[PDB]
Ligand binder design. Structure first.
Ligand code: HEM
Ligand SMILES: NS(=O)(=O)NCCSc1nonc1/C(=N/O)Nc1ccc(F)c(Br)c1
Ligand SMILES: NS(=O)(=O)NCCSc1nonc1/C(=N/O)Nc1ccc(F)c(Br)c1
Length: 377
């Protein structure tokens, strides 16, 4: 369909954990990144790899795992230990398979949200539910980086959003079959589920330490677009001649928030402002099927103009309960950014620095664009 699952939403259902034996030399390096980065053998280990053909990867789930393996290796190679000794050329034995596979999955050749959260997980017990206690990630960068907590919590917020995503068919059908009562029950279920996704978001404090995120994990998630340590981008040796720039990972790459924006007719990606340009660009980092779902929603008739035209106050209050749950999420998110970036940065990403300023201004603009779509203030 649009690769949307009814249980896990945009998450890859039950990711694959093992690659064919043909790829053992890839898998060994990814499984041992904390150790290999710590000693400083990681970059040697990459430079001595053979060139493995991607032809022995024979389905989507196996391609997704291979992207996740190669994306983590690539971040470990470029940033190394995390202190400024960078590499600007990615050796051909990684770059050629990584670029070929990325072109086939229609994704930029850099680690994205959909690799390290949406496919980087397993159930411990396949019988018991999708809870933190029954889950684990497949790969980590450094001992102590809190990557399990950070990836698993993001995932659980995605799985929470799933119960709301499966109501979107009901909304477009109720509109055209002119079914007022079922449209209203649907809009309230969406809002109920966005409110539950916010409470799951609170669990990030239970599992992620600000100091570990800011001084360790954040560095391996960063990219090479507008990054002065790699001001021209990365050379993907043997595939493109010139360096190329790609952005680092963020849940701006999550289809979740963008999809309820389109649904509720809130015009973020609309305009030429720098906030609209960012959010549109982050769509190039989403899997193609999810990109297409988003664009499909953009073309269907407007839920906002429907509600606005029917003089029906219960409909307007149900629409508003959806707009409100997005403002809440985005406001809790500002708090999150303050606690995990602005405050640790003060111990150039500080609140009044050049980075911490443009990012808070972007986030506050998106939240305030959302808040304006309220029908009742
Ligand atoms: C330690 C935790 C987190 C931090 C520091 C953080 C930080 C940021 C920052 C700085 C941005 C600005 C855009 C960019 O530079 O890419 C951003 C964007 C965004 N983040 Fe986060 N984030 C965290 C976790 C999450 C989680 C768990 C979610 C949702 C599950 C999320 C959802 C979003 C969304 C949707 C955007 C795009 C802006 C918007 O649509 O309102 N973030 N995040
Ligand atoms: N680390 S700090 O910058 O110095 N703290 C400044 C205030 S935040 C804070 N204080 O206690 N817990 C905090 C927290 N908030 O989300 N998460 C957390 C912290 C430590 C851990 F080992 C784990 Br697991 C999770
Ligand atoms: N260089 S920077 O100033 O710190 N800007 C960094 C841009 S935001 C950021 N950084 O890490 N995570 C970020 C994020 N933001 O929503 N969500 C997130 C959550 C789970 C993931 F698997 C990934 Br991938 C991303």
């Amino acid at each position: 369909a649009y690769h949307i699952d009814e249980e896990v939403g945009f998450a890859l259902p039950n990711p694959q954990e093992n690659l064919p034996d043909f790829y053992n030399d890839w898998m060994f390096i990814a499984k041992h990144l904390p150790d290999l980065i710590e000693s400083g053998q990681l970059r040697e280990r990459v430079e001595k790899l053979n060139m493995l053909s991607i032809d022995h990867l024979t389905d989507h789930k196996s391609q997704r795992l291979a992207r996740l393996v190669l994306g983590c290796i690539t971040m470990a190679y470029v940033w190394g230990k995390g202190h400024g000794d960078v590499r600007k050329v990615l050796p051909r034995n990684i770059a050629v398979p990584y670029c070929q596979l990325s072109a086939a999955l229609e994704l930029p050749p850099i680690l994205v949200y959909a690799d390290c959260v949406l496919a980087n997980w397993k159930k411990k017990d396949p019988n018991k539910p999708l809870t933190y206690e029954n889950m684990d990630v497949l790969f980590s960068f450094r001992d102590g980086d809190c990557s399990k907590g950070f990836f698993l919590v993001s995932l659980l917020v995605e799985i929470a959003a799933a119960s709301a995503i499966k109501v979107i068919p009901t909304v477009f059908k109720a509109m055209q079959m002119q079914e007022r009562d079922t449209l209203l029950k649907a809009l309230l279920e969406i809002a109920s589920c966005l409110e539950k996704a916010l409470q799951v978001f609170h669990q990030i404090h239970d599992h992620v330490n600000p100091k570990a995120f800011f001084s360790v994990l954040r560095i391996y998630l960063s990219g090479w677009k507008g990054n002065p340590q790699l001001s021209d981008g990365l050379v993907y040796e043997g595939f493109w001649e010139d360096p190329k720039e790609f952005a680092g990972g963020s849940a701006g790459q999550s289809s979740v928030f963008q999809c309820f924006d389109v649904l509720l007719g809130i015009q973020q990606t609309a305009g030429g402002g720098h906030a609209a340009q960012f959010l549109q660009d982050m769509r190039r980092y989403m899997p193609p099927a999810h990109r297409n779902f988003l664009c499909s929603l953009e073309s269907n008739p407007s839920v906002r103009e429907f509600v606005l035209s029917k003089g029906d106050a219960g409909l307007r209050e149900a629409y508003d309960a959806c707009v409100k749950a997005l403002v809440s999420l985005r406001s809790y998110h500002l708090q999150i950014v303050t606690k995990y970036i602005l405050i640790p940065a003060s111990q150039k990403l500080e609140a009044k620095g050049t980075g911490g300023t443009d990012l808070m201004n972007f986030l506050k603009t998106v939240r305030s664009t959302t808040e304006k779509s309220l029908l009742k203030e």
